[PDB]
Amino acid sequence: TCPNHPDAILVEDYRAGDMICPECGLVVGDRVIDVGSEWRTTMSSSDRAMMNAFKEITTMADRINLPRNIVDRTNNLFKQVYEQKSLKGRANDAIASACLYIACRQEGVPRTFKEICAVSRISKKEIGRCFKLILKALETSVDLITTGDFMSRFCSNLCLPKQVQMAATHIARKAVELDLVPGRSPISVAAAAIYMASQASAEKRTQKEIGDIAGVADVTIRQSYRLIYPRAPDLFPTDFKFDTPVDKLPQL
Amino acid sequence: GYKFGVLAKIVNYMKTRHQRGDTHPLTLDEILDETQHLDIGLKQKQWLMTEALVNNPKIEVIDGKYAFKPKYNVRDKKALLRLLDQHDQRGLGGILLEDIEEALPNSQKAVKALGDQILFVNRPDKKKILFFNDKSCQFSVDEEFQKLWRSVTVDSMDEEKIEEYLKRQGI
Amino acid sequence: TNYKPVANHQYNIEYERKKKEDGKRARADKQHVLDMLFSAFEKHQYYNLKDLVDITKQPVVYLKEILKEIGVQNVKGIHKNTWELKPE
DNA sequence: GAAGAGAGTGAGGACGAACGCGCCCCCACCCCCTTTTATAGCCCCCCTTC
DNA sequence: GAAGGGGGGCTATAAAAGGGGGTGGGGGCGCGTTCGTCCTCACTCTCTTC
Ligand SMILES: [Zn+2]
């Protein structure tokens, strides 16, 4: 506000913290800028219920070792869902478990409904029911999960070599591409692919072992494995070292 | 129940019987028949006859037999008005609306017919207390009058100042 | 091997199985409920509402209405106000 | 002319009402129960083969 | 006794019924501390006494 220059964009100055006429030199305001801070250089039931759910969300996260950013994302989902109040009837623990599942999906690291259930007192059925309701309430959507979204966790939890993990990811991706397992759950496809890749390397894991980490019954793995077994040589990566030849892979 | 359960069913059966409209009294043995209490103890038969059926305020001893007491209970508009008048005259106090409703079927007709004759006081639990409308001396005024009257604070003044005002204004 | 994925906790399904097998309490006829309430009155003078529900094995809302029809609740300064089976 | 109990005042110690602090309870509010159906996958229990 | 297969069950999807059961939010309500109220006691003046 230069008296000489009406409507002049005063320039901030960090020397003394004052705004100066950009083309007059006049200091308008002696030292008003406050440079140091300007530049980086008896509890309500709703709050108490929110606080307990926040504590529950963190407790669930540490069980599966989720990063704080997902927990922060989960808290935002809970506040949005809690504020909107379409799930007032549903238990807060169920809402939090669904929020934790949604937060994982939004961040690109999905956890299967069984994995969230294992860390929560709420069953998978109830979490799924809350999951759909939250999406409607928040008017949001989650990208469809793929077989490769669980390979890193499953293979690492099975202590399988990196080459096996890459081979399993290639097998699972190719199998879906070839439509060899239409309608099968991505987890089941991933579990079958891990078994196919595992049996083709030095580190061999039984169907029960793969099911435990993946939460998929060995029968389902057996079904998926039987569907992709015929095209085993095609699914495997071209530059894959077969400890056990593909022709001699288990048949069942 | 032994010595306690039988009497409860007798009272309940008697109450239901009156609701049907049978004002005729009933004997102790007759009532026992329909209440499935024929095997009641002998000492209870005399106890009910001597104490239960006389001390209770809902049992009337007529020609030796026992009958309900609808006269004490309010069952007419005139009785409702009279009961309140006696309460005010004798200073007994008000009666909860629920007590009148059970005693007086369709009490709304009687209450609305009397209109302003009944003074209603709303308790914190929504319960309404009925008081007689003594129409001897009445004085009702506009709302703002009370508002101005409320505006004149008097609890925060001392007696010396209150009485000093009288001589200050010369009265 | 910790927190292995599970569709439903073993304790949760067993509890659900027990509840499903047992089923919900039914509304018995007033005469039968009244007889049971009167009979149990001999054992002790006063009963708690929660404990009385177990003895009668009836829905709480239905039991309260039946209890209200005859029974009343007396305020006790030692623990709390509790229901009294004696109508008078 | 020369001195005792008692009380004002100063000053220390024990018990009850109020404030929490929750335990328990009562009351809306909601979800669950049930049945019907076709669909598909997934999963569990029982039977059978070796 | 181990493992595979057959049979069966769980889940979602609508909608409706009526009522039991679970759950969050208040609401009166007893119990572990805290401060004020009540009570106790040392050190002197005082009217009275001798
Ligand atoms: Zn200028």
Curated annotation (Swiss-Prot), chain A:
It holds the Pfam family Zn_Ribbon_TF. Keywords: Acetylation, Acyltransferase, Chromosome, DNA-binding, Host-virus interaction, Metal-binding, Nucleus, Phosphoprotein, Repeat, Transcription, Transcription regulation, Transferase, Zinc, Zinc-finger. SUPFAM superfamilies: Cyclin-like, Zinc beta-ribbon. Disulfide bonds: none annotated. InterPro entries: Cyclin-like_dom, Cyclin-like_sf, TFIIB, TFIIB_CS, TFIIB_cyclin, Znf_TFIIB. Acetylated. Autoacetylated; autoacetylation at Lys-174 stimulates transcription activation. It is found in: Nucleus; Chromosome. GO terms for molecular function: acetyltransferase activity; DNA-binding transcription factor binding; histone acetyltransferase activity; nuclear thyroid hormone receptor binding; promoter-specific chromatin binding; RNA polymerase II complex binding; RNA polymerase II core promoter sequence-specific DNA binding; RNA polymerase II general transcription initiation factor activity. The keyword Acetylation applies. Changing residue 38 to R/A/D: Defects in transcription start site selection. Supports a level of transcription equivalent to wild-type. Changing residue 222 to A: Reduces DNA-binding. GO terms for cellular component: cell division site; chromosome; germinal vesicle; kinetochore; nuclear body; nucleoplasm; nucleus; protein-DNA complex. A zinc finger (TFIIB-type) spans 1-29. GO terms for biological process: DNA-templated transcription initiation; meiotic sister chromatid cohesion; positive regulation of core promoter binding; protein acetylation; RNA polymerase II core complex assembly; RNA polymerase II preinitiation complex assembly; spindle assembly; transcription by RNA polymerase II. Changing residue 136 to L: Reduces interaction with VP16. PANTHER family: TRANSCRIPTION INITIATION FACTOR IIB, TRANSCRIPTION INITIATION FACTOR IIB-RELATED. Belongs to the TFIIB family. This is Transcription initiation factor IIB. It comes from Homo sapiens. The lineage of its organism: Eukaryota, Metazoa, Chordata, Craniata, Vertebrata.
From Swiss-Prot, chain B:
The modification N6-acetyllysine is found at residue 3. GO terms for biological process: transcription by RNA polymerase II; transcription initiation at RNA polymerase II promoter. Residues 1-75 bind DNA. GO terms for cellular component: cytosol; nucleoplasm; transcription factor TFIID complex; transcription factor TFIIE complex. It comes from the Eukaryota. Keywords: Acetylation, Disease variant, DNA-binding, Nucleus, Phosphoprotein, Transcription, Transcription regulation. It is found in: Nucleus. Transmembrane segments: none annotated. One of its GO terms (molecular function) is RNA binding. Recruits TFIIH to the initiation complex and stimulates the RNA polymerase II C-terminal domain kinase and DNA-dependent ATPase activities of TFIIH. Both TFIIH and TFIIE are required for promoter clearance by RNA polymerase. It is linked to Trichothiodystrophy 6, non-photosensitive: A form of trichothiodystrophy, a disease characterized by sulfur-deficient brittle hair and multisystem variable abnormalities. The spectrum of clinical features varies from mild disease with only hair involvement to severe disease with cutaneous, neurologic and profound developmental defects. Ichthyosis, intellectual and developmental disabilities, decreased fertility, abnormal characteristics at birth, ocular abnormalities, short stature, and infections are common manifestations. Belongs to the TFIIE beta subunit family. This is Transcription initiation factor IIE subunit beta. It comes from Homo sapiens.
Swiss-Prot record, chain C:
This is General transcription factor IIF subunit 2. Belongs to the TFIIF beta subunit family. DNA binds at residues 77, 79. TFIIF is a general transcription initiation factor that binds to RNA polymerase II and helps to recruit it to the initiation complex in collaboration with TFIIB. One of its GO terms (molecular function) is RNA polymerase II general transcription initiation factor activity. Heterodimer of an alpha and a beta subunit. Interacts with HTATSF1 and GPBP1. Interacts with URI1. Interacts with GTF2B (via N-terminus); this interaction is inhibited in presence of GTF2F1. GO terms for biological process: positive regulation of transcription by RNA polymerase II; transcription by RNA polymerase II; transcription elongation by RNA polymerase II; transcription initiation at RNA polymerase II promoter. One of its GO terms (cellular component) is nucleoplasm. Keywords: Acetylation, DNA-binding, Nucleus, Phosphoprotein, Transcription, Transcription regulation. It is found in: Nucleus. Its main location: nucleus. Disulfide bonds: none annotated.
